[PDB]
């Protein structure tokens, strides 16, 4: 069901692509959970996160409504889901830039980092 979570993210990312002029290469970096190698890809990620609501209108992480948010990353599984919740609390504390595109990617770095540490990768 984590698979299905990634599938939802990609649909969202597909509808976000034209408004930040992102490319298929940018989309592929996302599915593969890599850093964004372009600014548009960072903005693509901001657009997705904002649609999830994990990133708010002032470009800061919003961890309220925990389950609804974290399940968009890991699916419904309890052990996984719990870890994502903890990753949210960890990463909501980092310092990020005022630029929302760059802020989304600094959060994404934290997400991936913690996910590797906790075995979600």
Swiss-Prot record:
Its main location: secreted. It comes from the Eukaryota. One of its GO terms (molecular function) is odorant binding. GO terms for biological process: sensory perception of chemical stimulus; sensory perception of smell. The lineage of its organism: Eukaryota, Metazoa, Ecdysozoa, Arthropoda, Hexapoda. This is General odorant-binding protein 28a. It is found in: Secreted. One of its GO terms (cellular component) is extracellular space. Disulfide bonds join 16-47, 43-101, 91-110. Keywords: Disulfide bond, Secreted, Signal. Expressed in antenna, mostly on the medial and posterior surface of the third antennal segment.
């Amino acid at each position: 069901d984590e698979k299905e979570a990634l599938a939802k993210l990609m649909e969202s990312a597909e509808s976000c692509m034209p408004e930040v002029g992102a490319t298929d290469a940018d989309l592929q970096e996302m599915v593969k959970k890599q850093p964004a190698s372009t600014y548009a890809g960072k903005c693509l990620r901001a657009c997705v996160m904002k649609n999830i609501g994990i990133l708010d209108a002032n470009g800061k992480l919003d961890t309220e409504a925990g389950h609804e948010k974290a399940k968009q990353y890991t699916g419904n599984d309890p052990a996984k889901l719990k870890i994502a919740l903890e990753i949210g609390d960890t990463c909501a504390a980092i310092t990020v830039p005022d630029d929302h595109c760059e802020a989304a990617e600094a959060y994404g770095t934290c997400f991936r980092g913690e996910a590797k540490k906790h075995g979600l990768l």
